[PDB]
């Protein structure tokens, strides 16, 4: 963890761990 490869569910869960209950504005390579 902390510095690693991350994809799909693992990247979504890492974003929820980093951002907390506020979540993320990102969408998985959809326009962003």
């Amino acid at each position: 963890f902390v510095n690693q490869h991350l994809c799909g569910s693992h990247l979504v869960e890492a974003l929820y761990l980093v951002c907390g209950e506020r979540g993320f504005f990102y969408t998985p390579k959809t326009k962003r």
Partner: peptide, 21 residues
Amino acid sequence: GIVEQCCTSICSLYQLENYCN
């Protein structure tokens, strides 16, 4: 989008913070 970094190369919490609400 950060999937095109994290999924094939390395990324980190400081780079995930850039996408937080």
